[model samples]
Target: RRTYTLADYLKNTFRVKSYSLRWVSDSEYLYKQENNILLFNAEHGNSSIFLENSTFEIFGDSISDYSVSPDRLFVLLEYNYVKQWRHSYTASYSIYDLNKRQLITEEKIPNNTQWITWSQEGHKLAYVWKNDIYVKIEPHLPSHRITSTGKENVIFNGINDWVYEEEIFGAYSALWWSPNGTFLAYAQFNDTGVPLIEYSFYSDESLQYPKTVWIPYPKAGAVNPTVKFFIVNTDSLSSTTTTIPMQITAPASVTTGDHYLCDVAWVSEDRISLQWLRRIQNYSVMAICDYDKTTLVWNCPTTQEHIETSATGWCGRFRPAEPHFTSDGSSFYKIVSDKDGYKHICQFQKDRKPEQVCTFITKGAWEVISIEALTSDYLYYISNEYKEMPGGRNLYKIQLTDHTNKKCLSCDLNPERCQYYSVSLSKEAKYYQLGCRGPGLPLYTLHRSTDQKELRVLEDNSALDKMLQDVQMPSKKLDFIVLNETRFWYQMILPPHFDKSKKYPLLIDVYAGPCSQKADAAFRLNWATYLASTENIIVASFDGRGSGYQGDKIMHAINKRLGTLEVEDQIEAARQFLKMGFVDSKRVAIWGWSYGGYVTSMVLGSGSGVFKCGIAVAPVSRWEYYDSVYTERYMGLPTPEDNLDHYRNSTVMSRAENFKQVEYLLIHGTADDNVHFQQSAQISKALVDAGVDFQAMWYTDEDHGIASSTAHQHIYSHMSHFLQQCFSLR
Candidate 1:
């Protein structure tokens, strides 16, 4: 048997080369292999070259991404990229004509612009430059600046600010193009009142001076950026714009005040849909507005509205899913909570009166992950509708006329190998790419729509499977534990050559955040596998009260109490694991990253005497230091006037004195834009003030992910050595 090294895992263990699948139409798709683009015919199971390698080489720079025009005449090439955050980046774009087989660079796009978007109608393009929106009607024409009020770090038009991009829209561009391409709608973010977080960035190449960067980051109970919506009529070359009203007059339960404009969609040429969330995020309002060409104003009728309110938890599932519309624009589909707390698909009809009810397309104790594709006769979705396995996802299709007759599309595809699955469907639901994500080696296959026939195998991982034949691998077990008459799910990765008669060290992997499910049937070959196989330690994860996908009663149990129930659940789960015969109670440890890191610190500082040591990477020290939208949703608005105790008790700094009894290791990235370095800094400050001695590691200039360079492999190696030392003498 061969032992796996860090370099092996990083280089050759799980590497697979396959085509990037993207749908062009209901029966046609495009996949890229190296520098060439191949168009796949879903109906006939054949692929032909769409663009040759020579066409890509004409751009001079490497292509990071490319998008074909709606008419399939022009292709936009994106390259020379630099990423800012999760959803934001700046790249150089080049336009290439498929027919002409040449690059079109005469439009003279600005160098390193923020982002760009192509209108669905023609070769028209909209982009963000210097925080303002610009539109180009044709390739040779001049670009028009839509807004004149955009200023650096103050006003942002057609592009979201820091918080909005990270938390609200989850995308770089905030612009929406209408179906007919006559109008363009965008959101303007005003960050004039938000406070700035300044940090120093040191360059290893230069020893002279460090650069200071300022970001407008709003902490809990702090002032947030004001957002407004506007629509520009692109048909005329004028800069005249109509402001969409931000005010909402509704009941006190679901009222909108000092709200966040989370989503905006152009429903039609004359109408648009908006989703607004209150400051506390307990209530969400969905409304439609009409465009009045005569007065050049948006008429937002108060009648066509829907309000979602949650007493136990926050509205929607981790930010709202954008509503998908029907072809005629008379109806929309969305995933919302029913009375039983499960996220089910619902159809809202515009023809029905305001008081009429929306139709629920699917109903069960499980949840619909997403609505994949909606056709005229059928609706395809991904859900955990399987009552036995709540963590498994399978594709499903139900007739529009008979929702009760839903058929499972991916459950029995390969019952022995794949349990968790995902799908990518074509435009009209005529073809799909099935991804069998595992309890075994993953498999990817393309399938036809009518009879569940396999068209082709995109990737089968047969090479990796054969490579693992002689290597020792850990085994995974999925089960549940009974806690106070309730079943809490858990998964354990046992070491190779396990003996039930002998005890082994245990490491509790925890991330018991609100609406988070850690115990699932997804296959992976990561650090946990290495630890269990090489280090001879058992790694276990549990889904406790604050975890999601089970029900609201279990998930919302920690609402307005962030660090109480979730922390206690991890401690209890550790104690339960100690009762097993193959677990050594003396060598129990815990660790996590991000929200899980926060939980890890809380559990270790709990004074439960269950865990001997723990590691927290980029952990949040206090609720007040985190973002307002995510923190306030679970812990409520933290203020000196109200809910003071909830904010105080949920902080890791308040429990710094307790860490002296356990071995603690803290790691963080200096340039973490999401969970700022201020969090770990405050924790270190508190530990020092308490006269506590612990280990610490810092990744310079790395963000929350901390994988900017070789930092990922280095951090994992550091943690592995620390864990070995913690359980050395046990």
Candidate 2:
């Protein structure tokens, strides 16, 4: 049998099939394949072409993406797209009328559109251009300017700034439309006080001079971008004069100090809820506001506020969980930490008069991953409670009325092979498609929500399975190692034709960030698989202190301290792995990207004898160099009043002298905007200051992900080469 080789990974010769779908209605869903949109009527079991490939071929192959209106009247075609940051981008857009089978050319969305989104109900279009938001009731209708205070690098309307896009909402557009399309809610960011991180973008030799790119990125303890929430009545727009958007102020508990707008959900046509978090991220507030038609203004009283505070660390994973309000907007369900620090679903009323505002709905030692869907009858969620396995996820449903009729939906489906799943339910929760992302071959199955009856397989990837039968595939071992009486789990990818009795070179793949889980049941075909399958190396990952799923006791173990227990545990885990009697301790290595990269560098520079070499890609060299929302969440403020001392002590540069004891490979994308190339440059300077010799590589114009196809292949190839030479196997 042929081993999975590097070329196989680069070209994806044995690529696995996946289904990315969207539900158009309760009984219908949309799937795009062969450049055509197919709508499946789940109720009638009939499929038809909603849109043909020739419908938009007039635009040529430059169409990057498309968005379909909820009413299936129009499809927004996107082209001439250019990416900015993580989830932000600029693109030229065109609206195609599905009925007319032609593109709408008049009064089109402007070129270099910052962001755009469709109204949840109809064909109304709202997009941001030149930092300002514009609305169009129809494709050929004249657009109305909703805002004019937008300014580059200073004011952002209906769109998130750099930090907010990267850390807070994880998206570029800050605008959200009401369910009935009567109002539009948005967040205005004032980045005037925020400091900028300037870097040079060397695109190509043709641009003789390096373009200086400046971003308003706040570091730890720095001034953060101020935010304000606003909603405008789209149904009644001022004809001539600019209409002022109604402002809903954050509660004094948040406005008295630094704060951020976390989440927003429109409960009803005239009701809405907004989540706010303090700069410290320990305390958060969810405020429900209702429109007062008599006063012609929105009213948000303090009584309707729900408070969420974390005594251990930050409130939620990054910022806070969004509340799923009921249809009547009386109560809502949200995932929050229980008394035992485990994340569970808690139901909250609109008012806080009750002594206890939140009532626990699901209680257990395990944690709920997320709220999948909330209906009148039952609330569906995904949890890792099956067999008390924190790494495996299964869908479960419980009656919303009494928290009764609980059932594990996917656990018994194929327990011998499938453990981790991702389920998507159609609107109204009538049908769902279960994506089984294996401890086995990935399978996609559709089922009826009422009976959990399997209808048919959407995609079995049997072709991938058949192709894999002739390949020497690596085996995965998911288990735990007891450390300090705590069950810290680790996963290892062993070579094909296992000979565990023989010593194998060990490679530690770590991502020890807070609330991060590296060891999980979700199967992957990555560089580690290539190493174990062909290079004959044991690549493993460890979930130690500050890891997620188990509870906050483990998640907050390293709060206010970034590079301590999480870093030390990797060393401890490696030492434990060596003692397993089949590891080549002399050739042990560690590698990580971003936070994982931070851990890898910290572990290699810890003066720990466990690792002989390491690789860190775009690692954070110091706390002060990272963003405020994320860094301050775990490390606190980098000030004498908070956690300044530990910030200085935990820097990778501070331990640069220890790199002499082992070989190190440092990599970074020169144009990385997330961790920034500056972080890695700091490490290179520290190594030089310590008189240490190491290998370094920089990808031209690549971001933090190094996601370019050629660069991705080259980086993995280079790492494999580095590992091969260090293990004396080159």
Candidate 3:
């Protein structure tokens, strides 16, 4: 069997046009035509060539960093130009306006701004300059500096630093605008007191040793930045700052050893809701801050109106689920705990009256996956229920006023595969896209839906089915029996010509994180899986605790103690499969990327020796090494300056001594800004100190995600070789 290139895999596996696709922005519309970006019309027809016969400029193919105003599309472009002194690296931006019919405004927006956000109407553009925020009112206006206190080690404005962006707030920016766009609320992070962890990049020719770069990274149970909220009246062109604390007696804090301020949302004109958690991974509190846009003053508006949610006991703000807001903006909607061992939709009133909207969705346990908005009659959201096929997520809409009239929008179809419903712009609860796929089948039709029809086949790729018929592969979805009352769901794929009597080595893939769901009905023919199955290896995965598509109880359980619960669940699930007689327990291996990588380490070190070998790629060893916002929301912060034991228990660095018992492969990129490569290096040093033999691989300039040319080749080759060697053993 030959290893496929990334391009080949994408070409053969991905059914790109089998879905209703559109590239929407404030101004111009563009769509894909044979992988070429072309300007499109409203009726989904091509209008003119957007990028044709140009200087063959390859657009910065990063995530959607560009923005659009009503008049122009502001795109950040990287270009090379000759200067007076010499040739220099430069980045300039261009505005494409249809009215002008050509590129209109062009300007250089400093060098360091990576992430940019615009106002609602796209009038005022906000971008990160240096480590602080610089805003441009119009194309001609000089950029106004928002923060003057920013230094390399102390402060970060408009956008979050690497850690906060990756772990905490999910994105780079801490800046948010009010609904009316009168005020700009941004987070001021002060990490001046936190200890700096340094990493060295080896220089080849002239350098004697490696050059070091210092990062102020706080590990789990370490002192995080003192995060405070600030409001700048863009109208007045001035800013006011305030420090708000969790307003509870001995406040529902975690023992995890850190404090986190996360998810800042404007609930009302005078108030904003803040999700507060202490580092131990225990309890969470939502506090209201009454900020005044006119006076530039604010109060930590304490209300008995606290909704306590936790991943430890029963319920909590598990992942970044959609927060529902009424039209008037007086009250907001959030899924809160019902204390009946089930999670339900609860509407939070201004005075803190929790109204139970959708009461009886699931009897045993369920989670409100996503809430679109409050319709006049029904509250629309997706929930997990009717477990004919476990781990299948379904879309359902129930009357907000009347709970008994619950209707399942996606029940009749095979539950394991129904992906998601695309919400519409009117907030009118119309337009939905239902897609489904299975093994050996073309991801069938992409179904479109209106309020009346609710189901219409919009796009179908018969070409995929025709193509798949040529490949001879014996692949079937295998469902395991429920174990220990937890209707835990997993899928297994055996190799071609598999026999029940013969035992095969297993390859388990996982992403056991809160926001991640592995068992969705998605097309899964990739380079790794394709290579593994062709080599006569059995690949499998389980949707365990901390994974979505399950109810709130299971998904939020591993909140602060990130690795503890997920590790136990995956190991136990693997153990159950080993007992089925068809699996080779001695030859089992577990591997994952990011959080999954962290779990692999935990299973190899903490779990009862269930997995024989493990591979962790760019793993977060401890919560402390992560950013402040993400870690603190669930676990909270390390306090009293002596919570080292709590941090040690959760950190894989402390448990590196146990790697001697298992064959472990730890891989990371030296420039991995997400989960720094120093983490893997530190763990390697600790393992060596404990006399544990392990293999380590490092990609020189690759970041958190190892998607480099040489790195990709090295990773797949090493993985294939390891799997073949480990499984072929006696």
Compared with the true structure, the alpha-carbon lDDT of candidate 3 equals 0.60
In order, candidate lDDTs are 0.82, 0.90, 0.60
TM-score of every candidate relative to the true structure: 0.95, 0.99, 0.80
TM-score of 3: 0.80
Q: Give Cα distance to truth, residue 204, candidate 2, Å.
A: 2.1
- lDDT, residue 59, candidate 1: 56
- Among the numbered candidates, top lDDT falls to 2
lDDT of 1 by residue, 1-730 (tens): 7655555665546564334588888789888876788898886767899988777776576677888876677788888888888888888888787788778768767878798988966878889988988888765567888877889889998898998888787888988888778888888889988988877778685758888889888888889888777777787774444323223232233344567886787777877888888887778877777777787777666566666678987877676667877776778888887778878889886543654446788777788888898787788888877645777788999888887779998888888788888888877777789888857888899888888788888899898888887888889887889999998889999988888889999999988888888888788888888888888899999999978777677878988889889889888988888787889988999999999899999988888888899999999888888887788878777876767689987889889999998999999998888888889998989999999999999998888898855888889888988998899932
Ranking by lDDT: 2, 1, 3
Better of 2 and 3 by lDDT: 2
Which scores greater on lDDT, model 1 or model 2? 2
Candidate 2, 1-730: lDDT as tens digits: 7999988888889888888788999989999989898999775668999888776676788789889998999999989888889999899898998888788888878889999989999999899999899988787887899999999999999999999999999999899999989899999999999999887888878999989889999999899999989998887663655677899999989999899999999999889999999998999999999999898788889999888998898998777888998889899999999999999999888997555888888888899999999999899999999988889999999998778788999999989779999999999999999999969888888899989899888888899989999999999999999987888889999999878699999999988899999998987888888899998999999999999799889998999988999998888899999999889888899999999899999999999878889899999999899999999989888889889999999999998999999899999998888898889899999999999999999998888999999999899899989998888888
Per residue, candidate 3 scores C-alpha lDDT tens digits across 359-443 of 3433446666567556666676766554544344456777766677878766665434444333332224434445444333323
Candidate 1 residue 689 Cα shift, in angstroms, is: 2.3
